[PDB]
Swiss-Prot record, chain A:
Residues bearing the modification Phosphothreonine: 2
Residues of the whole record sequence present: 212 to 282 of 298
Expression sites (tissue/organ): Heart. The fetal heart shows a greater expression in the atrium than in the ventricle, while the adult heart shows a greater expression in the ventricle than in the atrium. Isoform 6 predominates in normal adult heart. Isoforms 1, 7 and 8 are expressed in fetal heart. Isoform 7 is also expressed in failing adult heart.
Name by which UniProt lists this protein: Troponin T, cardiac muscle
Family of this protein: Belongs to the troponin T family.
Organism, as annotated: Homo sapiens (Human)
UniProtKB/Swiss-Prot annotation, chain B:
Span of the entire protein shown here: 40 to 161 of 210
Source organism phylogeny: Eukaryota, Metazoa, Chordata, Craniata, Vertebrata
Gene that encodes the chain: TNNI3
One GO MF term attached to the UniProt entry: actin binding
Positions bearing the site annotation: Involved in TNI-TNT interactions: 41, 58
Family stated for the protein in its record: Belongs to the troponin I family.
Involvement in disease: Cardiomyopathy, familial hypertrophic, 7: A hereditary heart disorder characterized by ventricular hypertrophy, which is usually asymmetric and often involves the interventricular septum. The symptoms include dyspnea, syncope, collapse, palpitations, and chest pain. They can be readily provoked by exercise. The disorder has inter- and intrafamilial variability ranging from benign to malignant forms with high risk of cardiac failure and sudden cardiac death.
Quaternary structure, from the entry: Binds to actin and tropomyosin. Interacts with TRIM63. Interacts with STK4/MST1.
Protein name according to UniProt: Troponin I, cardiac muscle
UniProt keyword annotation of Acetylation present: yes
Entry-annotated residues carrying Phosphoserine: 3, 5, 38, 99
Post-translational changes noted in the entry: Phosphorylated at Ser-3 and Ser-5 by PRKCE; phosphorylation increases myocardium contractile dysfunction. Phosphorylation by STK4/MST1 alters its binding affinity to TNNC1 (cardiac Tn-C) and TNNT2 (cardiac Tn-T).
Curated annotation (Swiss-Prot), chain C:
Listed GO CC annotations: cardiac Troponin complex; cytosol; sarcomere; troponin complex
UniProt-recorded name of the protein: Troponin C, slow skeletal and cardiac muscles
Disease per record: Cardiomyopathy, dilated, 1Z: A disorder characterized by ventricular dilation and impaired systolic function, resulting in congestive heart failure and arrhythmia. Patients are at risk of premature death.
Ligand binding (Ca(2+) 2): 99, 101, 103, 105, 110
Length: 71, 110, 155
């Protein structure tokens, strides 16, 4: 590692000590639950986008056919 | 070969199961969503974990939020370029292309 | 579109064909050949608001005058009456359900599975003529544009 890579590595670990390191077991259980619900919600929006992508490729292909044939 | 009233009778039914296979495909995607989310966002097992392992879990969950959010941005951007070029194609293909009640109430009435 | 009107006439119960005949016979009062010229049609138009020109009135007649008489008889009158009484987004989503191999076209066999999954008992003539009505370039398949014109007027 150099120094920009050292900087990014440290500022990411600092992001965790600021959000986590001052909590007790009960205060930290509620935090993990809180963080997991964010992951669930983000994975759901990723799933919805993956399906939309599969469908666009079909619409793109059909439009590719129509231009290909109408000339 | 067959009457014009039949060929419309068949088309009305064609669109009726093409609509029932559209929304059957919907719930098949809803169940496919929960099954996928169960493997990706596994529910938490917090009982029995010590403070050391509670804190370790809270930290890797913190790093996973940032990771999944850019895994989602990368696919969000792909569907954004698709929308733009969908509009391009849909456009470049367009650039290549009395009253019953009134009439019956006037002559009769009831 | 067209043959959807011709189908609507064949579905008129004798309760409506008695309604329309009674109205048609009041239309042709004063006409010598028993049909609707511009004189009879203009009277009824004034009777409900407007006053079209003797050529705007002849355009309405020629839109349904299949025997070249310049007038409207009772059979042509029923076509007039049904013309006077889904979107591309809906039809595009349903189009994808027909195209099971997802190649962008609706070929013969994909039509038959859809037809055989409708509940009716499907005749080979039904298969034969639905593809003749749908496929207008004659290349053995219904494409998107042909599919839209093939479902025009279907609820
Ligand atoms: Ca005529
Ligand atoms: Ca196909
Ligand atoms: Ca074709």
């Amino acid at each position: 590692q150099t120094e920009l890579e050292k900087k990014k590595k440290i500022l990411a670990e600092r992001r965790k000590v600021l959000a986590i390191d001052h909590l007790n077991e009960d205060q930290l259980r509620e935090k993990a639950k809180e963080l997991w619900q964010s992951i669930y919600n983000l994975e759901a929006e990723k799933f919805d986008l993956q399906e939309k992508f599969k469908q666009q490729k079909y619409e793109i292909n059909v439009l590719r056919n129509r231009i290909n044939d109408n000339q | 070969k067959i009457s014009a009233s039949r060929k419309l009778q068949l088309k009305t039914l064609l669109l009726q199961i093409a609509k029932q296979e559209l929304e059957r495909e919907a719930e098949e995607r809803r169940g496919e969503k929960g099954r996928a989310l169960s493997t990706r966002a596994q529910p938490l097992e917090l009982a029995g974990l010590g403070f050391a392992e509670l804190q370790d879990l809270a930290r890797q969950l913190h790093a996973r939020v940032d990771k999944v959010d850019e895994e989602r941005y990368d696919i969000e951007a792909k569907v954004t370029k698709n929308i733009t070029e969908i509009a391009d194609l849909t456009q470049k293909i367009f650039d290549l292309r009395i009253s019953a009640d009134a009439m019956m109430q006037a002559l009769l009435g009831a | 579109m067209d043959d959807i009107y011709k189908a609507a006439v064949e579905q008129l119960t004798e309760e409506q064909k008695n309604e329309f005949k009674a109205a048609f016979d009041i239309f042709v009062l004063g006409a010598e050949d028993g049909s609707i010229s511009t004189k009879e049609l203009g009277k009824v138009m004034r009777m409900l608001g407007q006053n079209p020109t003797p050529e705007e009135l002849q355009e309405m007649i020629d839109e349904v005058d299949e025997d070249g008489s310049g007038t409207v008889d009772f059979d042509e009158f029923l076509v007039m009456m049904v013309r006077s009484m889904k979107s591309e987004e809906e039809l595009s989503d349903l189009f994808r359900m027909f195209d099971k191999n997802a190649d962008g076209y609706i070929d013969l066999e994909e039509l038959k599975i859809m037809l055989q999954a409708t509940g009716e008992t499907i005749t080979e003539d039904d298969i034969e003529e639905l593809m003749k009505d749908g496929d207008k370039n004659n290349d053995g398949r219904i494409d998107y544009d042909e599919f839209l014109e093939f479902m025009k007027g279907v609820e």
